[PDB]
């Protein structure tokens, strides 16, 4: 029930980007993968305890069941997991976008290297309604140079030099910029601090000039934790949003993607599955962060655990993008989204279609322009959905009794109450032919007069694709008329092409009146 | 789906039967075809409210109701006493508040013969 | 920003290529959805072919709303255009 | 699946994709790129708009503001893989009608 | 018995083009709204009339014509003290299951404004009275204080949609034949 | 679920018990006043 | 049309038109998306290479206008049935 | 496994027209469309060495590997049944070979083991 | 509650203060100014949504009266007058320290006993600022026509001339930097062209004129020469009745600083000298060096030749101020014995904590500039010993005096075993009392081929502490309002009467537990306010 439901269809006005917070990672996750090993020694069919291809994280097989949403393979849309690091590391993708925002702040009070009336001028060029991304990123070049042309901060006067890379994937801040004025309190304490260790082990005297303060992810997170929200708009970040802190721009937590993205493919070279590189890189992540978590708790050497945390720093910097291996190389996220026909060209821009067929082409004078002659053997393969009306009822009642053995028949059907389809070669047809509820769709074969397009594989221009009429012919090749070879620049020397068929009614009309 | 006004107007219970009997009329001979889901519900509105009235002209209904709402401002109870225990004043004692200390005249007997004359 | 009547009707009076390809695409699937026809059909199938014949007598019960790029309306009945 | 022994289904590539817009056809371009190939139905949440599963939101767990629509499956995996690293594709909707 | 001006969009399949404009709009809004509760408003039974109608727009993927339309419908919202001479067909041992027969039966009203000798007797009676008894299938007077409208769906009968608050505080409450 | 509390966990002393009454009437003047 | 000579290169497309998922279809993908998600940008979808990824109506060609069904009705039968408001 | 109309238990994959659909012969309703093709450590270490030793003399005596693979499970159960402790490691596995040599009914004797 | 513990700077503290005790519509707008910085109304309504443009001004006058924001007017040559609106950070601290002022009136005005204004003088603070501003005509025009008002009116000149009742003006309601600009431009337009020599010094010629103007104009509200009316009839002395005044935080925060210092004495001496120190501490409270240092807030603090001058003169002011250098002779008459006044003060110079340590012989005074850094170093090391192990207290002091400590000398200087210090040091990197210094002995800074060096870094340790406590304040404030959400139907019944016998139990157990919240917050707020001495 006695309750109404009503919802309009909707449209997309435009996607917008963000980086979600580390509290959102556990907010959308439901499982946790603390343990390491994928296959328990129960010798079961799906041995997965906690930290593996988890059955309520998703499903990567046809014989299993996704315990969260439901289903075997089609109902599951995948569900997310999460990780918890022992201590955070940098983000490899934002590694450029975290060092540019480090050059602007102070290194002691963590305030933007600007004066009060100066920064009030800069955001005035943000508040006007005319701002493009051309000039948004243009005026942000000036805000960084003024902070880099400003040596000492405003809140505690601390001198700040320059920070840049150490070429692994770590950055150092060159804090000392003296011209001739060595009489600075920080430098005098610096030699006063350094002289205490010169008494012991004085062989490090050639290492004094190279010695310099570093910025590990554990210092920089609390450095990013002090800086306020009122001044975020000057350096790229916006306020008023939950994830608007810069604290969420290095890896502290990591989500686990569903197993649909990383399918457990069975190559059938053995009864074992060739498990992909996506899981075993993730498996080394949770194993390394486990021993570092337990290592400092039990108590191990600093010089021992620092290379583990640096190995884990390089580990996450490979799971996303494998360019930073600095050596058969592992495939990563970046290593498959770009490239020649990895994505975006063979998966997004150019896809693969159903209802096609590729044989050779053959000349014929006797058929007309605008019509391709159709081989009959593929005419009983490629079909077309046809809704029933009172106008075509007598024809479709005659058509359905032919079946998929003579040419002018059907292959399948879909009744208005039926859900998926019904086959025609199984079961009685004539008793099934007598009912024919008008509100449904039938699946007839092709015939003369239908709308078929045709292409050339070297597509030089727009006239490399044209839509034609049809006529079924009892031979095994594509017969075309003599004039139409010129735009296809074809030669009948052993080449071949495919033909496509649309399966709506508005495309059946649109192909004639635009590419006829 | 946007509700513009929740309480747009008020309508008497006569038109609850009057317009709906016209909807029962052009309705494929209801109630006598013995020899959707909505048509049972609409008829359940027809039969239940009419029996309480039974067990007519709207011009007669308007004349007595114009005499009923003699109040200064608080009148809204003049619509609810149309089918709620007619010819009874101990029920009118329980309908509207502070009328036991305000109606102590021949009005409540004048309202009695209107309500009893309706039944 | 609103409806613009026939006084300020300052575009082409002509049924374009994209118009005639659009109205046939939106007509013929309604014929498959059991819409009643308006033309004296013969014994005839392929609801596109009855739809292109209905165009000959201009018996389409539709109207096209041309949008101006400043967000302005402009209406055109399907009989008003010629081809 | 690419391959004649792999039961075929041929790639309509990008160089052929641009010629359709050169005809200006706007519906079989939609039909032959997701309807004939890659149709998939996703329910999406409205506010903090990301996908959910069969009937849930699981990011504001009330499962009320849910919009039934459809996308390419190849688009469905697209903003799932970029969600694996710290990228939030915040989705914003309008109705088609009432211009 | 009161009107509620609302707005909504409506669809039509292309096979009802033989019918005129309004009578198909009436039909397609009926089975959407027939005996349906509204979130936080009430239960509109029948569309009363049509206020204004706009022009039919088309989805390019569907081909049908979709129309937004504003109108009001009839809905009963009696009063917050309204006398209702309803019936009953159920009794339980913690309150009373006063439900108006014929229309809706999702109503449990308590007895929270009565005297102190009120309990349950499992001998056909509500309780023993200090007084002609009342039973099912008869005109029983009961009024209304409050109502509770919630719209929650906690996925993981007591329908919490349309629930009313009633009492029997004064005399004559329990049977209309106690008076008149 | 988290460990290591702060060491300020004490029953309230009458030296500051009247001090805590000065808060609850303070907002009662403001909220029940104009705003 | 934007004031300056600029190529059709990576350097030439970073200033001509900025639309981040269309730029994902070009050579360098990852460098265009992090800084965009760092800036938390907002682009409406109107590109012909943009509408095909999401799968909605392309705005060019025969998808510019939209089709309206005439309702062939007026106010001559759109009167209320309101009667006996209060008496 | 169960139809929704006839509830049949027999399903037949039709490959006549290269659609590879799943359908029963009783009523003819399809089951599924668009098929989705699949495109201790000390106990571990003491068998990793024992794996090397099984492979050693099998290369010497030209033993085909479906015995050496089969003989490892004969060693695996007696590993659990405490047969290995105390006895010499070289002695026990050569006895484990001749079990599978006898079960496979080969020409291989027993003194060919002990002479090496 | 992992949602709350992540996304919250001091904005989650500042938004909830007006969400605690005020209407709801102002908690939205106060979050906008802190997040965005500064903005006028003409761009405010574009940022928020759900509040009309005059409903903004209807909301904005609420915290205008309570002095919770501070405005600035700037007009353009082409445009009209634009009123940029800033945030007030100290007017909202009044809502934080709201109860503590009532315990400050009593503990500092001890001349009276068993008075009949004990209930009244606790209400005047609730009268002076819960209304917002306050003038003399507001309380005399109350329901009491006289009721001995002349006793009460003469009671407040005792209560105003001790301080923290400074007449409000534009200076209290405008921030510190937007005043300094146009007065520096006033002195700069006082020096025109036709002085071309040393033009870098001529830019500073207005700046020397700005320094004397800054101390002058900040003393104008502190100037007590015009806050009083000498009345020839019916009285002897009275404040001027046409004075609009509120509280001043300055003497309270110096007075709150004064209570903080003596708590070190009770740790560092017994019960006799701490009682001796308490009396002489009180006399210097009304005229004390400023805690917030308005000179150092925003200005030429980037260059050390000016940044030194903010304490070179300030030490000379604190040394050469007459109103604190007591003779140690007047102390005996204030104690309820000049040898014992000198003998019990001799322990104050003998300790290595510089209070009453340096002086001219015969006169005695407590230094300030070299004392408050020792108090901040003292309490946090004790907090390390309080909430975690005392072995870290040994290690915090070991790295403190030993600059650039190594991993070998840490077992040479401090004496513990090897396995326990890993279980103690590793929690101090997590909480940032220790830091890391690396020496690259191989190429490209190899992590395994490197040894690691430590540091105290006496600035970053205390910045982490401040926001750790600013969140913990609002975390307990978050558990206040949520308890008022449930059980609200009988708290509404608890406010409609001015009686179910079992319902009253569910009102007391919720009321005893929130009584612990204010007490722990008062214990918490004292630990945080030590580190605002910057
Ligand atoms: Zn699931
Ligand atoms: Zn600094
Ligand atoms: Zn959402
Ligand atoms: Zn079956």
Name the biggest interface: A-D, 73 and 61 residues
Q: Structural class from helices and strands of chain A?
A: alpha+beta
The outline of chain A comes out as elongated
Strands ordered across the widest β-sheet of chain A: 9-15-14-17-8-16
Give the helix tally of chain D.
4
**How far do the termini of chain D sit from each other?**
42 Å
Amount of helix of chain A = 25-40%
Number of domains of chain A: 4
User: Compute the gyration radius of chain A: what is it?
Assistant: 34 Å
Task: Please bin the fraction of helical residues of chain D.
Answer: 25-40%
Hetero groups in this structure are: zinc ion
Helical run tally of chain A: 13
Biggest sheet: strand arrangement of chain D: 2-3
What's the overall geometry of chain D?
globular
User: What is the strand content of chain D?
Assistant: 15-25%
**Number of β-strand runs of chain D:** 4
Structural class of chain D: alpha+beta
Order of helices and strands of chain A: EHEEHHHEEHHEHHHEEEHEHEEHEEEEEH
Biggest beta sheet summary of chain D:
2 strands, antiparallel
Q: Radius of gyration of chain D, Cα only, in angstroms?
A: 17 Å
Subcellular location (chain G): Nucleus
Family (chain G): Belongs to the RNA polymerase beta' chain family.
Subunit structure (chain G): Component of the RNA polymerase III (Pol III) complex consisting of 17 subunits.
Organism (chain G): Saccharomyces cerevisiae (strain ATCC 204508 / S288c) (Baker's yeast)
Describe the structure.
This is part of a larger assembly, with 9 protein chains of 8 kinds. Chain D is about 25% helix and about 20% strand. Chain D is of the alpha+beta class. Chain D has a two-stranded antiparallel sheet. The radius of gyration of chain D is 17 Å and the shape is globular. Chain E has 1 helix and 10 strands, in the order βαβββββββββ. Chain E has 2 domains: about 80 residues, RNA polymerase Rpb7-like, N-terminal domain (Dna Ligase, domain 1); about 100 residues, OB fold (Dihydrolipoamide Acetyltransferase, E2P) (Beta Barrel). Chain E starts with a strand and ends in a 16-residue tail after the last strand. In chain E, strands 1, 2, 3, 4, 5 and 6 form a 6-stranded antiparallel sheet that branches. In chain E, strands 7-8 form a two-stranded antiparallel sheet. Chain E has a two-stranded antiparallel sheet with strand order 9-10. The longest helix of chain E has 13 residues. Chain E has about 180 residues and is mainly beta. Chain F has about 35 residues and is mostly helical. In chain F, about 50% of the residues lie in helices and about 0% in strands. Chain F contains 1 helix and no strands. The termini of chain F are far apart. The relative contact order of chain F is 0.10. Chain H has about 120 residues and is mainly alpha-helical. In chain H, about 50% of the residues lie in helices and about 10% in strands. Chain H has 4 helices and 3 strands. Chain H has a 3-stranded antiparallel sheet with strand order 1-2-3, with no helix packed on it. In chain H, helix 2 crosses helix 3. Chain H is elongated and about 70 Å long. The interface between A and E is medium-sized, with 8 and 17 residues. One zinc ion binds next to loops of chain D. It is classed as transcription. Keywords: Transcription, RNA Polymerase III, tfiiib, Pre-initiation complex, Closed complex, Brf1, Bdp1, TBP, Pol III, Enzyme. The entry is titled "RNA Polymerase III closed complex CC1". Chains A, G are DNA-directed RNA polymerase III subunit RPC1. Organism of A, G: Saccharomyces cerevisiae (strain ATCC 204508 / S288c). EC number of A, G: 2.7.7.6.
